[PDB]
Design a protein around this ligand. Structure first.
Ligand SMILES: *[C@@H]1O[C@H](CO)[C@@H](O)[C@H](O)[C@H]1NC(C)=O
Lengths: 642, 903, 193
C-alpha cells in the first residue's frame, strides 16, 4: 500500500514564493506528480504551473515551488476568511487539502528623520517595501497621514518600482496646525487589512543646551529597604562637558494609569561636576499614602521628575524616570519558551526565562524545580536556563513548580511559577514516540547544529523505519525539507544541520516517521522543536570615523566617513542633533523592532511538540495530508490562539 | 579697539538644522573579503553638539539592515550660545540671553561682545551706534550677557550677536531666527455643514450648493487662515434575510443507492446541499473536509444513474420498465444543476432532452407521462391537481430551459419545442384554479419573459398576504410552490415583493430531507440560493463631486464609489472665499467646512499666577537699593520658586547683603554665586522655598555701580515655579525710565522704536545757507513748515506739542493749508533737550515716514532726521547775537518758496 | 645699524611711506592683513639685531560660509570651502534641478557671497493619464499628479451592475522619467472591451 503525502505551510500568502513537500512512501519506480491550486470552492485554476517527478535515489521526496497570483482585495474590512484548494496527483492517485489564506503581501517599514517637529517644518520619511523574505520589491503602496483626532488629512498611492525597495517622501506641516501625536499610516494596495504605522510629535520647542539623565541605584525598589529609593542625577552638556547648576527633584507613585505625587519628597540639590544625589525615604513614601499595609504597594511603580536649572538661569531642562517597580522580589519566572507537551518515559527539556521587573533578562541566576537536589541551573546571556527532567510512563499530567535558588534571599524574595504539561497521545495507544533533542544555545549563523533523533517503539517493527522526514520552517515559510536515514537497530541518530543567515531570527524543526502498525494500521508519529538564533542583520552595516583620533572636530570642518556594507546594496543616511532626542526618543527605527514585527507575524503558535501528530504539525504551522486518510485538523483562524 | 578683529570681518554661524544628511548612496566598491567600503567626505554644520548618524542598507540578496547609531562630538574652545525662545509676541518687551563659554584650561579671555542692530527690533543698538560690552571671562567658565529687545514686525525675524577677544585670534558669532507672533489665539470657526442627496434633495438629479466665506470678524489683520473642506460618503446597507444555518443542513448529505428512482432521491439532497453551501459560503462552520466527500457522493450518484440510462437515452426505474417522462425530466433538471460540481457527459443529457422532445411531446406542445414513476412522494405537488397536463408541461419545460445553454447548439428541435409548449402554457394560464400550478407554470413562463400583463397580475394576486403561495392540503406542496414563485419573482426582478416571501419561508423552519421531501428540499434550496445570489446587500453609491474655487480656474474633481465609502476626501484653501460645489449622482454624502484663524481676542498676555512689583530706589561710588515684592495667585502658598535677576550694566549686588538672605530661613542662594567675585556677576538667582498667597512677600538688597557709563540697560526680574516655566512674570527696573520700560511709540496695533537721537545734530557746527538749501532739497525730505508752539500737553510717556503752522515752505504727501494746527510727538527725556516752550516760533522739516495715523488726519513725529531750529522773534532779531540766524532763516525761506529746488 | 628692507610677508599690507632701505633700531612699522585675508592690526619692530620681529598668528585667509543641505538634494563638495573652490549640486532621484548645478567660491573683494544660488530640486510632475473609452481610473487624486503616483483602471458597471466587457492589459500604471524632465507614464496599456 504505497502512501502519498503532502506537506504545506499552515497559512498561504499571495505574491510570495511558497514551497510544498511531496512524498511517496513504500513505492516502486519513478512516480510523476502534478500540482494544481484552485479557488475555494469552484475552479479558477490559480496555479496549475508546477509539475515534478519523484524518483528513487531521490528517496521519493520532492519540492514544489509556486507563487500564488493575487485577486487583490474586493471585500472586505469585515472579511471574511478566504481559502484555496491545493490538489496533487501522483500519476493516478489524488490527494488534496484546503488551506487558509492571509492577504499579507510582505512587510512595510517607515523611517522618519526626527522624532519631533515644529509647525511650518518638513517631515522627511522613507518607506521600505519588502516581501516575507525581507527582500526588496517594487509594489503599489497606499499612504495616509492622520492627525491626533484620527482624521487622515493627506492620502496618496505610490509605486516603489525601480526604487530598490526605498521610497523617499516628505510632508510639510502647516503653520496653523493641531498640536499632538501625529501618525503616518501605510499599507499594500492588495492588503488593506495589514497596516504599518509610525508616530511623530508636533510641538512648540527649542533645542536645549544640555541633557539630563536620572538613574536609580537599582532598577526596582525593595519594599523593606530602610534606605529608601536612591537616585543619582547626571546632567551633561551636548558636547560632553559636565554641568554646574541647581536641580529640583520630586517623587511619585504610579498605580494603573493614575499617578499620585509626593509633596514631602521635594528636594533642592546642588549639581557639582555634572552629578547629584537624592533619596526618597521610606517614611515619606508610606506617609504620603494612608493605606497602612506596606505590602499593598507591591505591583506599583515609582517615578522621579528632576528639573535642572543652570547657574545662569537661562536654560532649564526636565527629565523623568518612570516605571520603577516596587517589588518583594528582584526576579520573575516565565515559561513562554517551554513546550507544553511531553513524551512519557522520555527526557522533558524545560526552558525557564527569569527576568527583572523591568523586563531585562537576569544574568547568572540559580533556578530549580521542586524537588529537588539533582536539578539546578544558571541563567544564560539571553536570560534562559535549561532544566531537563526524567519522565514517568503515567498518563497523569506533569505538574512542574520552578523556583529561584539564589542565596542571600529569605525565600520570601524568591520567585516561583507553576506549569503543567500534557502527555502526547499516540495512535491506538501504540506507545510509539519520537524525541527530538537539540541542546546547544547561543546559536549563530555558520555554526553546525547536531539534532538528536531518539526513537521509541517496539523492536518488532523497528526495522521498518529506514528514515525520518524533517522540515525546517522559518519566517512562516518552509526553509528546508530533507531525509535523515536510519539503519535497523539505531535508536538514536544524529543529523548535522548547517546554519546560514536564512535561519534568522529563529526556526522550527519538525520531524516525522510513518509505518504500518498493528494489524494493517497506518501510523504517523511526529515531533517538533523551536530553535532561537542570535538576532542580527543578514549582512553588515557599519558607520565609523575616517581619520585618526587626535581631538574633536571643529564646526565647519570637513569629516571623512567610513561605511562598511554589502556589495551592490543601497544605503540611506540621516543625521540628527542629539538635543532632539532629549525631547523625544520614541518611535526610532531599529533592527530589533524589525525582527520583533517578524516574530509577531509567525504562524507557529507553540514552542514545540503537540498533543498528537496532527497537533504537532498544526501548532508548528504545518498541514499534513495523506491518501490513506491521515491528516491534520483545519485551522480557520488567522491569528495565534491566546 | 586695540588689536582686535573687526565686527564686519566676522561671519556668524547661521546654520542650526535639527536634521540633515538625507543622502542616498550605493556601494559600488569591489568587495575585499565580502565587505565593500565607501569613504564619504561630508561637511559638518555650524551647530555645536553631538551628531548622531543612522544608516539603513537595502540589498537585492541580503535584504534590509538597520545599522547601529554613530556619534560625532562637535565643539570649540570658545563659543557663543545664544538662547532664544520659540516665539515672541509683537511689541512686547523681552529679555534674551547670550551665554559665552570659555573652556580653555589655564587661560582667561578679555572679551568684547556686541549685539547687531535690526530694524525689526528695538534695542540700545542704533543705526549709527552699536551696543557693546567688554567683560572678562575666567578659565573653564561661562558668562551670561542679557539683552532687552522689543519685536516690531511679524513673521520670522533674525537675531545676530558677535564677539571677539582682545590680544588673541579667537572670535565667534551667532545668527538665529525667531517667530514673531501677533496678539491673539488660534480659534476654529465652523463654517458650514451641508447634507448631500442629489437624488432626493437635488433638482434634475443634480444638487448644487453655495458656500459663503467665513465670518472672521474678530480675525487679526494680515494674519493667515486655513479653510478645510471634508467630503464624507455614507454607506447604506439593506438588511438581507438570514441564510439558513449550516447546522441544520448536516443531515442533507446522503449516500445515493437503489434503482433508477431511489438513486435520484438520494442524489438530490447531497447535490442541493453543495449548491446552497457554495453560495452561502457556510463551509467554514460546516467544515471544509466534508465538501469533497459530498462531491464523491454526487459523482457516485451520477455514475450509478448511468446504469439506468436506456439506449433511447430515456431514464426509467428498471431497465425492463417503460421510460418515464417525469423521471427523465428530473434527471435532466438535476444533472443541469450538477454541471457546476462534477463532470457530466453532454451526450447523455442532451440525448435525454432530444428523446423527450422527439418522443414525449404532443402536437399541441404538451408533454405527457406514458409510464408514471413508482414513487408518488418524489414528484411533490403534481398529485391531486387534475391540472397535471399543465403542471407536467411546466416541469418538463423548466428542465428543458435549464439544459438549454448546453444543448442549444446541439439539438435543433429544442427552441421549437420550448416555444411550442410555451404557447400552450400561455393560452391556458388564466384558467388555473390552484396556486401550485400558478407558481410552477409562472416560473415556467418567466424564463421566456412571457409572463406579462394579465398573466403576471394573476400570478401576483394569487399570493395570500403577499407572502405565501398556498393551497389547502399538505404543507410541502405550499412550500415547493412558494419556492417556484420565488424563482419567478427573481426571474422578473421584482424585489419589492420578494422580502415578505423569504421571511415566510425561513419562518416555516423547514430544512427538508425527509420522506417525500425531494421536491420541497430541492426547490426551496434552489430558490433560497438564487435569492442570496441575486440579493443586493447595499444601495448603489456613485458620487460625482466637483469644486469651483474663485482662486483656482482649475476644476477640482472627486469621484466617490461604494468601495470609496470608507475613504474621506480632504481639500484645503488658505484664502477665505465663497465657493461653489457641484454634486451629481446617487448616494448620500456629508460636507463639512471649517476654518482655523487668528483672533483679535485680548489680552492673552499677563503674569498668570504671579504678582510682581519691582522698585529700585536711591540709597541715602553710587549705591542703590533694589526691592522685589511678590505674591502668588491661588488658594495656597506656592512651592519652591525661582527669582532670576539680571543686572543694569555696570552694577553688582552688595556681597555682604546677600549672606543675611542666604543664611536667613526660607531663602537660598547657591555658594557658587556667593563666593564668586564681585565683578562679573550680572546674573543672580535667588531660590525661594515659598511665596505667600495671602500677603506680599518682599525682599531687598543694595547694588553698587562699579562702572559708570552712558545709557544703561534696565535689569530684569523673573519669578517662576520650578515645575512650570510657562507660567511666570517678568519685570524690569530702571532709575530714569518708568517701570523699566524702553521708549517706544504705539498707536493702534503698531509700534516704532524711540531709542535713537531726538533730532538732527545741533549746531555747532553752525549752519549756513547752502547747508540748509542743499539739505532741504534732498529728494527724501517731504515737508518744511514754519510753526508756532501753542500749548504743551505733557503725559506719562509722550509729550505732545501743539504747533500752529504759520506758513508752508514745502508741502508733502499731506494736504495742509496755512493756519491749521498740527500735533508733534516727542519721547519724554528729549523734552529738556528740545527746551520747547509756548509762544515761541520754530522751524521744522521731516520725512514721509514720520506720520502718525492715516490721511487726511495726521500727527507728526520727531525723529533722528527731524530738523528743529528756533526762530527768533522779530523784536529779538534786533539783538546783535541773532543777526546771522535771522538772515539765514529769511534767506532759506524765500529761496525755498519762490525758486524751489534746481533738481 | 642699520636693519635692511623688511622681508615680504605678502599676506599683509603696509600703507604708509616706505622711502628707505636701512631702518634704525627700535622703529615700529604697521602691517595690516591683505584684503584677501583677515587679521588683527599689528606692528613689527627691529630686534635691535637688525632683524624684524615675528608675527604671532594674527592673520588668516578667508572662506565662503557654510554650504546648506538643500531639500531633497545632495551636495558634493570636493576639496575645501576656500576661495576659488568649486562645489556641485545633484538631485539624486525623481526631481528636476532649477538653478545652476555648479557653484563657485567667490571673491567680490569686499566680502564673499556665493556666485550661484542654491538650486531647488522639485518632484517630477506628470500630465493627465491617457483616457480610454468605456472605462475609468480610480484614485483619491485625479486632477493633480506627481512623480511616483500610481493609478489603477477599472470598467464601469452601469447601474444595477453586470460584468460589462473585460478589464485587459495591465490596469495599474505610474509616473516615471527616463531623463531628467517632466514625467511620462510607464505605459498607455489599459482597455475595457
Ligand atoms: C527544492 O528543490 C530546489 C532545487 O530544484 C532546491 O534548491 C530547494 O532547496 C528545494 N526546496 C526545499 C524547501 O527544500
Amino acid at each position: 500500500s504505497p502512501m502519498y503525502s503532502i506537506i504545506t505551510p499552515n497559512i498561504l500568502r499571495l505574491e510570495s514564493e511558497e514551497t510544498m513537500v511531496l512524498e511517496a512512501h513504500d513505492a516502486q519506480g519513478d512516480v510523476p506528480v502534478t500540482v494544481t491550486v484552485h479557488d475555494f470552492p469552484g475552479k479558477k485554476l490559480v496555479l496549475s504551473s508546477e509539475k515534478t517527478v519523484l524518483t528513487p535515489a531521490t528517496n521519493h521526496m520532492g519540492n514544489v515551488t509556486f507563487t500564488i497570483p493575487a485577486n487583490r482585495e474586493f471585500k472586505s474590512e469585515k472579511g471574511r476568511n478566504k481559502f484555496v484548494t491545493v490538489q496533487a496527483t501522483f500519476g493516478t492517485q489524488v490527494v488534496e487539502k484546503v488551506v487558509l489564506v492571509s492577504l499579507q503581501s510582505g512587510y512595510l517599514f517607515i523611517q522618519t528623520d526626527k522624532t519631533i517637529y515644529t509647525p511650518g517644518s518638513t517631515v522627511l520619511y522613507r518607506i521600505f517595501t519588502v516581501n516575507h523574505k525581507l527582500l526588496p520589491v517594487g509594489r503599489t503602496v497606499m499612504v495616509n497621514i492622520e492627525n491626533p483626532e484620527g482624521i487622515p488629512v493627506k492620502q496618496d498611492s505610490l509605486s516603489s518600482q525601480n526604487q530598490l525597495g526605498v521610497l523617499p517622501l516628505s510632508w510639510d506641516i502647516p503653520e496653523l496646525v493641531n498640536m499632538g501625536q501625529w501618525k503616518i499610516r501605510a499599507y499594500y494596495e492588495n492588503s488593506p487589512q495589514q497596516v504599518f504605522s509610525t508616530e511623530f510629535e508636533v510641538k512648540e520647542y527649542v533645542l536645549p543646551s544640555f541633557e539630563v539623565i536620572v538613574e536609580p541605584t537599582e532598577k526596582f525598589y525593595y519594599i523593606y529597604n530602610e534606605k529608601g529609593l536612591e537616585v543619582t542625577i547626571t546632567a551633561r552638556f551636548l558636547y560632553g562637558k559636565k554641568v554646574e547648576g541647581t536641580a529640583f527633584v520630586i517623587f511619585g507613585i504610579q498605580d494603573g494609569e493614575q499617578r499620585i505625587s509626593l509633596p514631602e519628597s521635594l528636594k533642592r540639590i546642588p549639581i557639582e561636576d555634572g552629578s547629584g544625589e537624592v533619596v526618597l525615604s521610606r517614611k515619606v513614601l508610606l506617609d504620603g499614602v494612608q493605606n497602612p499595609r506596606a505590602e499593598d504597594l507591591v505591583g506599583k511603580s515609582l517615578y522621579v521628575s528632576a528639573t535642572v536649572i543652570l547657574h545662569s538661569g537661562s536654560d532649564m531642562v526636565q527629565a523623568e524616570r518612570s516605571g520603577i517597580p516596587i517589588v518583594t522580589s528582584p526576579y520573575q519566572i516565565h515559561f513562554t519558551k517551554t513546550p507544553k507537551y511531553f513524551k512519557p518515559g522520555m527526557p522533558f527539556d524545560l526552558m525557564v526565562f527569569v527576568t527583572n521587573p523591568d523586563g531585562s533578562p537576569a544574568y547568572r541566576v540559580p533556578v530549580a524545580v521542586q524537588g529537588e537536589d539533582t536539578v539546578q541551573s544558571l541563567t544564560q546571556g539571553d536570560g534562559v536556563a535549561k532544566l531537563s527532567i526524567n519522565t514517568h510512563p503515567s498518563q497523569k499530567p506533569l505538574s512542574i513548580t520552578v523556583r529561584t535558588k539564589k542565596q542571600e534571599l529569605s525565600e520570601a524574595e524568591q520567585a516561583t511559577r507553576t506549569m503543567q504539561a500534557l502527555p502526547y497521545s499516540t495512535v491506538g495507544n501504540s506507545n510509539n514516540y519520537l524525541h527530538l533533542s537539540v541542546l546547544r544555545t547561543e546559536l549563530r549563523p555558520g555554526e553546525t547544529l547536531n539534532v538528536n533523533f531518539l526513537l521509541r517503539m517496539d523492536r518488532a517493527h523497528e526495522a521498518k523505519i529506514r528514515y525520518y522526514t524533517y522540515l525546517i520552517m522559518n519566517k512562516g515559510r518552509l526553509l528546508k525539507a530533507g531525509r535523515q536515514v536510519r539503519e535497523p537497530g539505531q535508536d538514536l541518530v544524529v543529523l548535522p544541520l548547517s546554519i546560514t543567515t536564512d535561519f534568522i531570527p529563529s526556526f522550527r524543526l519538525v520531524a516525522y516517521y510513518t509505518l504500518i502498525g498493528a494489524s494493517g494500521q497506518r501510523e504517523v508519529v511526529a515531533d517538533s522543536v523551536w530553535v532561537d538564533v542570535k538576532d542580527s542583520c543578514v549582512g553588515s552595516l557599519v558607520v565609523k570615523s575616517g581619520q585618526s583620533e587626535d581631538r574633536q572636530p571643529v564646526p565647519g570642518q570637513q569629516m571623512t566617513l567610513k561605511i562598511e556594507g554589502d556589495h551592490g546594496a543601497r544605503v540611506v543616511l540621516v543625521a540628527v542633533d542629539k538635543g532632539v532626542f532629549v525631547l523625544n526618543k520614541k518611535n526610532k527605527l531599529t533592527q530589533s523592532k524589525i525582527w520583533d514585527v517578524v516574530e509577531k507575524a509567525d504562524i507557529g503558535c507553540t514552542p514545540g511538540s503537540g498533543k498528537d501528530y496532527a497537533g504537532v504539525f498544526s501548532d508548528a504551522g504545518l498541514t499534513f495530508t495523506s491518501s490513506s486518510g491521515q491528516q491534520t485538523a483545519q485551522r480557520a483562524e488567522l491569528q495565534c490562539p491566546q | 579697539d586695540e588689536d582686535i578683529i573687526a565686527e564686519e570681518n566676522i561671519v556668524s554661524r547661521s546654520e542650526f538644522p535639527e536634521s540633515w544628511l538625507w543622502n542616498v548612496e550605493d556601494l559600488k566598491e569591489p568587495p575585499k573579503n565580502g565587505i565593500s567600503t565607501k569613504l564619504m567626505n561630508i561637511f559638518l554644520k555650524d551647530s555645536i553638539t553631538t551628531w548622531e548618524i543612522l544608516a539603513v542598507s537595502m540589498s537585492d540578496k541580503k535584504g534590509i539592515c538597520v545599522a547601529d547609531p554613530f556619534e560625532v562630538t562637535v565643539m570649540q574652545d570658545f563659543f557663543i550660545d545664544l538662547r532664544l525662545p520659540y516665539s515672541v509676541v509683537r511689541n512686547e518687551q523681552v529679555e534674551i540671553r547670550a551665554v559665552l563659554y570659555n573652556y580653555r584650561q589655564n587661560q582667561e579671555l578679555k572679551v568684547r561682545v556686541e549685539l547687531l542692530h535690526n530694524p525689526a527690533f528695538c534695542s540700545l543698538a542704533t543705526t549709527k551706534r552699536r551696543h557693546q560690552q567688554t567683560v572678562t571671562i575666567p578659565p573653564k567658565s561661562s558668562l551670561s550677557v542679557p539683552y532687552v529687545i522689543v519685536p516690531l514686525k511679524t513673521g520670522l525675524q533674525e537675531v545676530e550677536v558677535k564677539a571677539a577677544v582682545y590680544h588673541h585670534f579667537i572670535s565667534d558669532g551667532v545668527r538665529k531666527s525667531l517667530k514673531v507672533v501677533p496678539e491673539g489665539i488660534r480659534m476654529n470657526k465652523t463654517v458650514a455643514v451641508r447634507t448631500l442627496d442629489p437624488e432626493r434633495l437635488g433638482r434634475e438629479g443634480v444638487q448644487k450648493e453655495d458656500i459663503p466665506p467665513a465670518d472672521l470678524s474678530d480675525q487679526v489683520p494680515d494674519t493667515e487662515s486655513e479653510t478645510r473642506i471634508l467630503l464624507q460618503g455614507t454607506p447604506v446597507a439593506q438588511m438581507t434575510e438570514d441564510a439558513v444555518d449550516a447546522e441544520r443542513l448536516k443531515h442533507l448529505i446522503v449516500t445515493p443507492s437503489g434503482c433508477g428512482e431511489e438513486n435520484m432521491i438520494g442524489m438530490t439532497p447531497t447535490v442541493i446541499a453543495v449548491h446552497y453551501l457554495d453560495e452561502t459560503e457556510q463551509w467554514e462552520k460546516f467544515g471544509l473536509e466534508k465538501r469533497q466527500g459530498a462531491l464523491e457522493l454526487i459523482k457516485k450518484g451520477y455514475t450509478q444513474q448511468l446504469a439506468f440510462r436506456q439506449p433511447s437515452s430515456a431514464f426509467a426505474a428498471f431497465v425492463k420498465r417503460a421510460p418515464s417522462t417525469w423521471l427523465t425530466a428530473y434527471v435532466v433538471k438535476v444533472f443541469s444543476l450538477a454541471v457546476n460540481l462534477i463532470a457530466i457527459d453532454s451526450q447523455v443529457l442532451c440525448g435525454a432532452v432530444k428523446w423527450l422532445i422527439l418522443e414525449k411531446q404532443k402536437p399541441d406542445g404538451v408533454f405527457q407521462e406514458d409510464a408514471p414513476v413508482i414513487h408518488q412522494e418524489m414528484i411533490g405537488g403534481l398529485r391531486n391537481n387534475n391540472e397535471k397536463d399543465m403542471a407536467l408541461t411546466a416541469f418538463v419545460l423548466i428542465s428543458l430551459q435549464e439544459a438549454k445553454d448546453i444543448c442549444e447548439e446541439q439539438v435543433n428541435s429544442l427552441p421549437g419545442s420550448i416555444t411550442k409548449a410555451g404557447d400552450f402554457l400561455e393560452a391556458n394560464y388564466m384558467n388555473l384554479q390552484r396556486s401550485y400550478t400558478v407558481a410552477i407554470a409562472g416560473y415556467a413562463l418567466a424564463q421566456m419573459g412571457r409572463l406579462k400583463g394579465p398573466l403576471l397580475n394573476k400570478f401576483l394576486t394569487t399570493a395570500k398576504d403577499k407572502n405565501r403561495w398556498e393551497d389547502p392540503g399538505k404543507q410541502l406542496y405550499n412550500v415547493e410552490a412558494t419556492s417556484y414563485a420565488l424563482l419567478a419573482l427573481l426571474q422578473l426582478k421584482d424585489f419589492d415583493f420578494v422580502p415578505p416571501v423569504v421571511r415566510w419561508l425561513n419562518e416555516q423552519r423547514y430544512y427538508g430531507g425527509g420522506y417525500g421531501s425531494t421536491q420541497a428540499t430541492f426547490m426551496v434550496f434552489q430558490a433560497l440560493a438564487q435569492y442570496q445570489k441575486d440579493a443586493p446587500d447595499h444601495q448603489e453609491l456613485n458620487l460625482d463631486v466637483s469644486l469651483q474655487l474663485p482662486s483656482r480656474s482649475s476644476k477640482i474633481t472627486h469621484r466617490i464609489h461604494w468601495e470609496s465609502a470608507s475613504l474621506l476626501r480632504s481639500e484645503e484653501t488658505k484664502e477665505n472665499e465663497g465657493f461653489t460645489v457641484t454634486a451629481e449622482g446617487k448616494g448620500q454624502g456629508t460636507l463639512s467646512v471649517v476654518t482655523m484663524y487668528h483672533a483679535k481676542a485680548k489680552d492673552q498676555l499677563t503674569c498668570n499666577k504671579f504678582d510682581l512689583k519691582v522698585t529700585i530706589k536711591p540709597a541715602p561710588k553710587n549705591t542703590m537699593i533694589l526691592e522685589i515684592c511678590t505674591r502668588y495667585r491661588g488658594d495656597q502658598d506656592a512651592t519652591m520658586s525661582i527669582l532670576d535677576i539680571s543686572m543694569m550694566t555696570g552694577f553688582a549686588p552688595d556681597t555682604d547683603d546677600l549672606k543675611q538672605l542666604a543664611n536667613g530661613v526660607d531663602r537660598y542662594i547657591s555658594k557658587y554665586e556667593l563666593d564668586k567675585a564681585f565683578s562679573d556677576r550680572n546674573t543672580l538667582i535667588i531660590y525661594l522655598d515659598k511665596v505667600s498667597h495671602s500677603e506680599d512677600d518682599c525682599l531687598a538688597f543694595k547694588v553698587h555701580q562699579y562702572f559708570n557709563v552712558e545709557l544703561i540697560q534696565p535689569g530684569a526680574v523673573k519669578v517662576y515655579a520650578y515645575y512650570n516655566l510657562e507660567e511666570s512674570c517678568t519685570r524690569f527696573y530702571h532709575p530714569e525710565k518708568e517701570d523699566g520700560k524702553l521708549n517706544k511709540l504705539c498707536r493702534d496695533e503698531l509700534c516704532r522704536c524711540a531709542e535713537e537721537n531726538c533730532f538732527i545734530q545741533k549746531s555747532d557746527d553752525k549752519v549756513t545757507l547752502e547747508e540748509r538749501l542743499d539739505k532741504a532739497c534732498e529728494p527724501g525730505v517731504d515737508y518744511v513748515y514754519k510753526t508756532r508752539l501753542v500749548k504743551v500737553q505733557l503725559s506719562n510717556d509722550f509729550d505732545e506739542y501743539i504747533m500752529a503752522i504759520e506758513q508752508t515752505i514745502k508741502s508733502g504727501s499731506d494736504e495742509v493749508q496755512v493756519g491749521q494746527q498740527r500735533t508733534f510727538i516727542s519721547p519724554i527725556k528729549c523734552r529738556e533737550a528740545l527746551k520747547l516752550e509756548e509762544k515761541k516760533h520754530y522751524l521744522m522739516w521731516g520725512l514721509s515716514s514720520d506720520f502718525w495715523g492715516e490721511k487726511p488726519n495726521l500727527s507728526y513725529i520727531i525723529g533722528k532726521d527731524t530738523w528743529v531750529e528756533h526762530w527768533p522773534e522779530e523784536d529779538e532779531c534786533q539783538d546783535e547775537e541773532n543777526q546771522k540766524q535771522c538772515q539765514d532763516l529769511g534767506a532759506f525761506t524765500e529761496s525755498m518758496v519762490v525758486f524751489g529746488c534746481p533738481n | 645699524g642699520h636693519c635692511q628692507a623688511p622681508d615680504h610677508f605678502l599676506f599683509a599690507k603696509l600703507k604708509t611711506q616706505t622711502n628707505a632701505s636701512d631702518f634704525p633700531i627700535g622703529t615700529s612699522l604697521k602691517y595690516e592683513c591683505r584684503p584677501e585675508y583677515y587679521g588683527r592690526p599689528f606692528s613689527i619692530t627691529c630686534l635691535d639685531n637688525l632683524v624684524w620681529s615675528s608675527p604671532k598668528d594674527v592673520c588668516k585667509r578667508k572662506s565662503c560660509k557654510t554650504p546648506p543641505d538643500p531639500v531633497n538634494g545632495m551636495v558634493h563638495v570636493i576639496t575645501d570651502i576656500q576661495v576659488g573652490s568649486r562645489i556641485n549640486y545633484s538631485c539624486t532621484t525623481g526631481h528636476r534641478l532649477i538653478g545652476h548645478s555648479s557653484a563657485e567660491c567667490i571673491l567680490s573683494g569686499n566680502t564673499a557671497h556665493w556666485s550661484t544660488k542654491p538650486p531647488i530640486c522639485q518632484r517630477i510632475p506628470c500630465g493627465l493619464p491617457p483616457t480610454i473609452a468605456n472605462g475609468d481610473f480610480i484614485s483619491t487624486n485625479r486632477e493633480n499628479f506627481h512623480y511616483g503616483s500610481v493609478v489603477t483602471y477599472r470598467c464601469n458597471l452601469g447601474s444595477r451592475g453586470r460584468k460589462v466587457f473585460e478589464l485587459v492589459g495591465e490596469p495599474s500604471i505610474y509616473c516615471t522619467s527616463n531623463d531628467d524632465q517632466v514625467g511620462i507614464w510607464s505605459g498607455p496599456a489599459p482597455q475595457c472591451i
